[PDB]
Amino acid sequence: SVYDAAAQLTADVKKDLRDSWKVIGSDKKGNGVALMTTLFADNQETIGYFKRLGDVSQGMANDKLRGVSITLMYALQNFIDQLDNPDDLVCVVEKFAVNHITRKISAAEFGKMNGPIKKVLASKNFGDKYANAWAKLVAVVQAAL
Amino acid sequence: SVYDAAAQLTADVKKDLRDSWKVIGSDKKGNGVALMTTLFADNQETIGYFKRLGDVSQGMANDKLRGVSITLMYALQNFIDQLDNPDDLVCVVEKFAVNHITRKISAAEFGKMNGPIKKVLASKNFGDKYANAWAKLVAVVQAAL
Ligand code: HEM
Ligand code: HEM
Q: Where are the alpha helices (DSSP H) in chain A?
A: 2-6, 11-24, 28-42, 63-81, 86-102, 107-110, 114-123, 128-142
Q: Rounded to the nearest 5 degrees, what angle is found at the Cα of B51, between the Cα atoms of B98 and A140?
A: 70
| Through-space distance between the first and last CA atoms of chain A, rounded to whole angstroms | 10
PDB resolution in Å: 2.1
For the CA atoms of B62, A92, B96, A65, the dihedral, rounded to the nearest 10 degrees, stands at -170
The Cα–Cα gap between A62 and A64 comes to 6
* Phi and psi at residue B9, to the nearest 5°: -80, 85
The Cα–Cα gap between B138 and B94 comes to 12
The Cα–Cα gap between A82 and A14 comes to 10
Q: How many domains does chain A have?
A: 1
* A58 and chain B in contact, CB less than 8 A: no
Q: Which CATH number covers residue B31?
A: 1.10.490.10
CA-nearest residue of chain A to B88?
Answer: A67
The Cα–Cα gap between A35 and B69 comes to 26
* B50 and chain A in contact, CB less than 8 A: no
Asked if B100 and B113 count as a contact pair (C-beta separation under 8 A), the reply is: no
* Radius of gyration of chain B, Cα coordinates, nearest whole angstrom: 15
**Quick one: which of A117, A118, A121, A130 has its CA closest to A16?**
A130
Residue type, A109: E
> Containing domain of residue B143, as a range?
1-145
Burial B34-72 (b: 16+ CB within 10 A, else e): bbbbbbbeeeeebeeebeebeebeebeebbbbbbbbbbb
Tell me which residue in B64, B71, B91 faces A67 most closely, judged by beta carbons.
B91
Query: Which of the 8 DSSP states describes residue A8?
Result: T
Report which ligand 1 atom has the smallest distance to the Cα of A52: 40
CB atoms within 10 A of CB A58: 14
The closest ligand to the CA of B68 turns out to be 2
**Structure determined by:** X-ray
The Cα–Cα gap between B25 and B31 comes to 8
